Amino acid sequence: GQALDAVRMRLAQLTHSLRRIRDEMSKAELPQWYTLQSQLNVTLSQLVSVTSTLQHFQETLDSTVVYPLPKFPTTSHESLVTTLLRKKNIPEVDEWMKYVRETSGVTTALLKDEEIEKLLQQDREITNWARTTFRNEYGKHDFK
Amino acid sequence: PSYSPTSPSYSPTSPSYSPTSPSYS
Amino acid sequence: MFFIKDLSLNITLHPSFFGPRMKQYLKTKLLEEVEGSCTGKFGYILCVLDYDNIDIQRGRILPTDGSAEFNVKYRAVVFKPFKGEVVDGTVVSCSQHGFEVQVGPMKVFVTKHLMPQDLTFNAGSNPPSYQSSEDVITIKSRIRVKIEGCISQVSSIHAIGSIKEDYLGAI
Amino acid sequence: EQFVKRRRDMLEHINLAMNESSLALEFVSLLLSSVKESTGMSSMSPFLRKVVKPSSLNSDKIPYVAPTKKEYIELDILNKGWKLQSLNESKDLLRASFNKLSSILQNEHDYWNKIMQSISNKDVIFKIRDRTSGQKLLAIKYGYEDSGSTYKHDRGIANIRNNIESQNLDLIPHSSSVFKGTDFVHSVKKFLRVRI
Amino acid sequence: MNVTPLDELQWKSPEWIQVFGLRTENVLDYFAESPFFDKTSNNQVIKMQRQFSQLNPARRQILFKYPMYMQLEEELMKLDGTEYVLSSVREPDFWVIRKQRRTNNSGVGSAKGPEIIPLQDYYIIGANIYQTIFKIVQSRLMSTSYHLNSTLESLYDLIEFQPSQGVHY
Amino acid sequence: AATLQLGQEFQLKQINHQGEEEELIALNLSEARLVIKEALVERRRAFKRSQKKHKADDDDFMHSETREKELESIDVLLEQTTGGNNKDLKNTMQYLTNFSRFRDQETVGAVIQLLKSTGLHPFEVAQLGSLACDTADEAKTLIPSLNNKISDDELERILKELSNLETLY
Amino acid sequence: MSNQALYEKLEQTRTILSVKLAELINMTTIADRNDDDEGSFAQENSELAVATTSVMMVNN
Which Gene3D superfamilies match (chain F)? Predict the structure, then answer.
């Protein structure tokens, strides 16, 4: 419950920041650019913190089993229950996902040790080489 | 205390995207 | 410790300021005399709220000199500690007898008898500091001090604190 | 009108983004309310408070699914796939940003060079704040005030304006702020005539 | 081959409710023909055993309320494995089952009874059936992030810069 | 105030100029710094309005990029609002700025909500807002009032959440 | 004055260098790394949150 409580408070403050940026964008007059940048950066880093904390406590969230209250009446609140207990993406995200699979050529249910595995090994090395090259370039010139 | 509670942001107008397919017997 | 309190003051206005703009002179006098002061009854006077909402009272011309005295009430944020208070602060100066920690606008001193022996004075370090197995305390190091006593004068309040027990030192 | 259209579009987009985010808080506020009522009361919306007494979320235990090669390698190569797409979009967005920046930036170097090679030295120069605009503009003192003249009516101050249409430089005096047009030269051109 | 996740899978059987109707007596009978009911579960084995024999907080409340539920224990205690049992019922529209698997560890040194372990969540709402909240939260957050990205790229397109003023609109 | 001995001058119940009892108000470094900054900028705006009466730029002060820029804006504010005759105010403001745990108003509100949701004493709440403790026992020893009054799990949760809430500089 | 401008350009240059190195490492190991050894520290625990953090890096 502690992990979900932290999840709750952080998500609540994130929603509060979203409400903030909303009611300062809803004005007919746009404020100064700098205030918009500050709000954007704060809210966006807060979203990063949300993602990181959600990532930290995956096990507590997975262990929890959802069950309706005995006192909660489903006969009158079935619409509210079905609003919360359904969780599919917006279609423009699933069609974006399908277009991304098609554009990249990636598909992840039949892959085996032949050509794609030699390509996978031949990719690791470019990253390491580029990292070392830029470390060398940084070391070449004194930046202090 | 609590500076301000959150405004109710319910969206009942959201149509939902529940896939329905296993109806035929 | 920061708190909101209701304060009053008696201010004497010179006869040469007797004109239609007397409220402005009273406001300037109040702001210039009260803000930043220290009173042993209420600690340092940090700030005054609702400047536009200053309360005023009718004048009462003194029978001896002609200066008009006014009673002004307001609400102010002030700082004052209590016995047994624990506060974080910044090390100011290092000495062999102990150290001095600035907390808010005040100074709390700790004597070497008031820390555990694990903290040893190092003078060869630049700056000289207190070094232990886990905690190192020096300039600009956040240090928690448990205030034990306070001495109040007209313009300032000094404090003496101890860190003799556990969970004290560098954070 | 396109600005209004795009502003409405981004408003409705952010509203759609926040509508789904609200439900996350709605579902997750229940646990503390179940554990501690008083702290949890404020978390939920008033409508959800009216819906039911909140004790909804209670702790429960479920075991972790037995792992195998089957889903982690597919997941991590699918994530490689999504991050290769983010790299692609990264390169494309950076290229577009740099193209826009290069085009605009070379435009202001064009105007900058025009300004630099259009200005001569000439007289005593400062920055002043315009009464109507409020910004800083270059001004030149041309008047005989320092030369010994006692004429107090005019200060001999002319503001420098870079002509947008002709890409040239013009001088606008302080006193004659009524004539706003291209016929200023002939309208203000006065002279002294002696007839015998 | 694209498969719809079973968590969102919803079955409707109008013919069964028209013929028999919704009741706790035949709620398991209603569930039997669903895809979620595994044919390898010991419940089906008990069903064929019964057929052959014929041919030849609220947990304690629902425990004591029905005798067929009793018969369910005295026919299920002998067989250990994946089994389907009722969780709770509120009439006349809401039923939920309890999806648990049993391992009757009768080894020496364990004074506890058979081990009961959850496997899945199933909710019978009306004539419909419903089956992770982590996925819901991450999906909502990612769609929100996509919309925010679209809005911010549009706003940055609207942005215009001049050296002598800064950035304006 | 180890034993919550606040005396008559700082009683929990305060009598205001309106004659109604109020809860004693305690502010940590962040709340006090934000309040004094708001008061100073409001006074500067009032002074400018008065000067315009006798005869845009203010948005950059409240939003500071860095600590050094915030300190420079603070110095300008003191020069234009205080007159430079009050060194104690400058020292207090510098101490607030250097050791402000939280810079944004929303995060400070989050900290206030987290600390005062349990209904603890305002002294303890302000102390917790001022002090960042790694472990619950550390805070309990350094705050003797918190002993016997808050469960260790709750204090640990609050401290961890507050440490997570700290905005990176 | 001019010394303040010197210092400001100093953090300007170092921030360029640091963000350059950051975007370099992010895009190079944008291909997520799976290593059985405990020494490696690369976590991708939630599916689409990864792409969100990626576009985070891009926008920053």
Answer: 1.20.1250.40
Instruction: Look up residue C49 and give its amino acid.
Output: L
Touch between chain F and chain B: 3 or more Cβ pairs under 8 Å:
yes
CA E89/CA F21 separation, integer angstroms: 52
Q: Which of E137, E141, E147 to mutate to test the interface with D (most CBs of D within 10 A)?
A: E147
Q: What Rg, from alpha-carbon coordinates, does chain C have? A: 22
Q: Are F130 and F28 in contact (CB under 8 A)?
A: yes
Class of domain C85-171: mainly beta
Contact D22 B5 (CB under 8 A): no
DSSP summary character for residue F135? S
Residue C87 in contact with residue C81, Cβ under 8 Å?
A: yes
* Structure-token pair, residue E147: 């919309």
Q: Two tokens at C31? A: 């702001």
Q: Do F92 and C105 touch (CB under 8 A)?
A: yes
Domain membership of residue F79 as a residue range: 27-51+66-169
Is any Cβ of chain G less than 8 angstroms from the Cβ of E134? Answer: yes
* Separation between Cα atoms, residue F61 and residue F80, nearest integer Å: 13
Question: Hey, are the CB atoms on A143 and G49 less than 8 Å from each other?
Answer: no
CATH of the domain at F134: 1.20.1250.40
Q: Could you give the residue ranges of the DSSP H alpha helices within A1-144?
A: 2-25, 33-56, 58-63, 74-84, 91-104, 115-140
Q: What is the resolution of this structure in A?
A: 3.3
Residue D167 region, left (φ>0) first, then alpha (ψ -120 to 50), else beta?
Answer: left
DSSP H or E segment with residue C157: strand C157-162
Site of tokens 């190092």: C122
Distance from CA of A62 to the nearest CA of B (A): 22
At C107, the amino acid letter reads: K
- Just give the CATH number of C1-84: 3.30.1490.120
Q: Taking CB atoms and an 8 Å cutoff, what residues of chain F touch C144?
A: 131, 142
Domain range summary for chain C, segments of one domain joined by +: 1-84, 85-171
Closest chain G residue to D75, measured at CA: G47
Q: Which residue has the tokens 């990612």?
A: E142
Task: Determine whether the interchain pair G55/E145 forms a contact, defined as Cβ–Cβ distance below 8 Å.
Answer: yes
Q: How was this structure determined?
A: cryo-EM
Q: What is the largest CA-CA distance in chain G?
A: 55
Instruction: Inspect the interface and report whether the beta carbons of B12 and A83 lie closer than 8 Å.
Output: yes
